[PDB]
Design a protein around this ligand. Structure first.
Ligand SMILES: Nc1ncnc2c1ncn2[C@@H]1O[C@H](COP(=O)(O)OP(=O)(O)OC[C@H]2O[C@H](O)[C@H](O)[C@@H]2O)[C@@H](O)[C@H]1O
Ligand SMILES: CC(=O)Nc1ccsc1C(=O)O
Ligand SMILES: [Cl-]
Ligand SMILES: [Cl-]
Ligand SMILES: [Zn+2]
Length: 282
């Protein structure tokens, strides 16, 4: 905990010049159109534009800790809005271009955005989610569950159980939820494209999951302002704000980014909505 390896923190930011950025997001659109099974991998960088600091960016929680300074929050977790990137990921699932979403984020924003939980792995937990120790029943709360490290919250299971409810936030020693990890691993293996958005990919095994896509000839795109552990393994590395990348990508795919109706939980993915016909690529 005190000595925990917090990794490479505060590496320099890289900015692809506009022409190169325009060319790479078009190439990404090409890869999404070619791909049968697209898995997205999200970390703290997709929530920075809603006021939540990341961990290893220049003003990251861990980076600021290393320099004797404090990260800064411009929102509560409760008053945080899903970013353009969050809402672009909801649409891609709706139109059938996203098979599965793997996230390391505990900020609750994917769930709250209306993203279906049966297509989401929350590898590090969710600040709004408590779980019954007895029956494993999960509750998605409108406020952050007051505890972290799989501690008793003080509330009891209401299943037609009085089981102890505990937070889902892993501490350093806690291994990943077996259900979320199994499903993240299956989706990543079966993907022919994994796209990473705002994760430095430094945490095992979360950070390694995109590499599993490379097995049997999958393609790996890394979208990140900083270098990431697996940059060498990527067919495409885009250095720019994930919101700029996802808004240009949606525009290329002929999709609107949907409006956020406020906090809404969706347990189960609906049948695919209609989407634009595919371009002639070759
Ligand atoms: N707007 C942005 N656009 C693009 N990249 C961005 C943006 N904002 C930040 N970044 C990049 O986004 C990256 C975010 O990297 P890290 O901060 O390591 O977050 P993680 O999710 O991978 O951390 C994994 C776990 O580690 C912890 O211990 C927890 O347990 C976490 O769950 C940076 O490299 C930024 O350059
Ligand atoms: C970036 C982030 O999720 N930080 C976090 C998560 C739970 S408590 C906390 C913090 O920075 O205090
Ligand atoms: Cl923390
Ligand atoms: Cl913790
Ligand atoms: Zn229960």
């Amino acid at each position: 905990p005190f000595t925990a390896d917090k990794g490479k923190c505060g590496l320099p930011e890289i900015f692809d010049p506009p022409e190169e950025l325009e060319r790479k997001v078009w190439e990404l659109a090409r890869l999404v159109w070619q791909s049968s099974s697209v898995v997205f991998h999200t970390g703290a960088g997709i929530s920075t534009a809603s006021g939540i600091p990341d961990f290893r960016g220049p003003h990251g929680v861990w980076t600021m800790e290393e320099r004797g300074l404090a990260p800064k929050f411009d929102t509560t977790f409760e008053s945080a809005r899903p970013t353009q990137t969050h809402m672009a990921l909801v649409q891609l699932e709706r139109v059938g271009l996203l098979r599965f979403l793997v996230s390391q984020n505990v900020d609750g924003l994917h769930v709250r955005s209306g993203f279906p939980r049966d297509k989401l792995a929350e590898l590090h937990g969710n600040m709004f989610v408590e779980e019954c120790a007895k029956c494993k029943t999960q509750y998605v709360r409108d406020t952050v569950v007051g505890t972290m490290g799989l501690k008793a919250t003080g509330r009891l299971c209401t299943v037609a159980c009085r089981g102890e409810l505990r937070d889902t936030i892993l501490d350093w020693e806690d291994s990943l939820p077996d259900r979320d990890l199994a499903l993240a691993d299956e989706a990543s293996r079966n993907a022919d494209l994994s796209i990473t958005l705002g994760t430095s990919l430094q945490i095992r095994p979360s950070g390694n999951l995109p590499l599993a896509t490379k097995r049997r000839g999958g393609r790996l795109v890394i979208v990140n302002l900083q270098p990431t552990k697996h940059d060498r393994h990527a067919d495409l590395r885009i250095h720019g704000y994930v919101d700029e990348v996802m808004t240009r990508l949606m525009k290329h795919l002929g999709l609107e980014i949907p409006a956020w109706d406020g906090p809404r939980v969706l347990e189960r993915a609906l049948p695919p909505l209609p989407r634009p016909p595919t371009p002639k690529l070759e």
